[PDB]
Amino acid sequence: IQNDFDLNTSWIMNDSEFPKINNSGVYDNVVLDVGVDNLTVNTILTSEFVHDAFSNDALNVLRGMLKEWWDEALKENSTADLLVNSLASWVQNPNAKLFDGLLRYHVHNLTKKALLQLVNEFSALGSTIVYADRNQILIKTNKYSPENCYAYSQYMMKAVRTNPMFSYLDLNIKRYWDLLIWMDKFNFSGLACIEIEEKENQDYTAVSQWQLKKFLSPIYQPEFEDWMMIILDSMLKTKQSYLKLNSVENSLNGFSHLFSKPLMKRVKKLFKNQQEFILDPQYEADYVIPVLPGSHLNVKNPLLELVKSLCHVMLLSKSTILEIRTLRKELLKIFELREFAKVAEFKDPSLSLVVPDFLCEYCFFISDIDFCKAAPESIFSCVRCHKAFNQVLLQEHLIQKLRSDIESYLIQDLRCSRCHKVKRDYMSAHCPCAGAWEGTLPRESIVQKLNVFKQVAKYYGFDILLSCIADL
């Protein structure tokens, strides 16, 4: 029977995407960057009518197998440890015999449920979830000083470990964030300390990871980085002053007062210089707009996007919004624009194309990969180990994703216009009520996806993917 096409099977093979949580904002509190390991094995070990159910007998058999595997690996057995490590890669890989898609779907669903339960448990006490994933979790701590979170973090980790459901999780803390400006995984900046020490002030190092800076003119990026450093220093200064004094938080309220006038004068000088030297032939080198895969915005005046980014990064405060809006209006008054114009609205200058669950055999490590937003020297190498990836595998997986997208669009259902009931007739003019059918998957979405595939295949040297497109 397995050779026959079926809707439920075809839906359960291709739903491999893993959701994630991202809450943007500016945090003056300390944030803990933790990592979760061996999640799949814990999910497996812990926990007729339904037709998508996998045979529970086999599930219990493999659970007992894995339990004895864990017990043997505990008592000085390298082979058992290596085999338990490779269990997950065996589960994912269909090339291995005795494979079944239903078991993979069941495992993935249970893993998602376990992750949401872990998020709920972390949310029970005083904590805020900034980012979540299969590998990284960011948690906001109510305290203000990293030196006072030693026993707090240790006790939270111990309490999480002691829970019977999470007995097999391995939790490691990587970084402590004194002040964070978080908007995305690839777009954040703040001051961090590696590990808090005793009797000594911690070593603080500032980081600045902004892929947005790559979309500016080659003449305004130094200004962008300089002003970002200046504003971060001002935020640190005002938070320190507020702490020394003792949805509003006076830790940050009143930080733009330090640099408003110099910023205004610098913007005026930049505007004058751009006006004078934009149509010169030899000065046109630095005003050339860079092109990068996933870009879709056609823009003319680079200074407008510079100020738009410099204001949108500010607009993440969510507590000093009025001051930022007044500063934005004052900046826009330098141009001959108005407050609510469409041209003065910030957007994401890059699209997204993510390949889920790419496996590194040298680590048995599972993570996604973004072909558009992630910087080079990371697409071609594993996150943990610095081992180069095989390129034809990447191109083959891209082709797989594109073909699966085409099939999924072609196998979509039809939905009525006024009421959102599903079409239940093999042939009919329209709904019994008023309204005509429309597809669940719109055409423009897949058209844009094919366009971004073209852009990705053009940026890197991918002959096989180009021939894949050309055959259509």
């Binding site: 919004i321 009025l322 809006r325 007044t326 209006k329 108005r338 407050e339 609510f340 114009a341 469409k342």
Partner: protein, 95 residues
């Protein structure tokens, strides 16, 4: 004698404000808001233009009209949500 004219006004500010007023309102409370209030905002702006004996509507008159309408709407709710709506609508009448 004076008949004001309406050319250089922000399309998006007024449209977004009307969308915001359609939000909340019956969806959260009970006061009804319809298309008539948009025309009322325009009429109040024209009246403010008239008061200066000016033939054209400026931006300050539109700001005054929108401030008046937003204040009159927000100041007729329960005491539980009045402060919340006051700080929610503060982005349209910054001045």
């Amino acid at each position: 004698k004076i008949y004001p004219k309406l050319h250089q006004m922000d399309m998006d500010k007024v449209s977004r404000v009307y969308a915001d007023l359609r939000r909340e309102s019956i969806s959260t409370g009970s006061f009804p808001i319809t298309v008539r209030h948009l025309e009322s905002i325009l009429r109040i702006a024209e009246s403010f233009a008239k008061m200066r004996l000016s033939e054209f509507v400026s931006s300050y008159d539109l700001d005054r009209a929108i401030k008046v309408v937003v204040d009159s709407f927000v100041d007729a709710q329960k005491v539980s949500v009045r402060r919340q709506l006051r700080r929610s609508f503060a982005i349209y009448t910054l001045g």
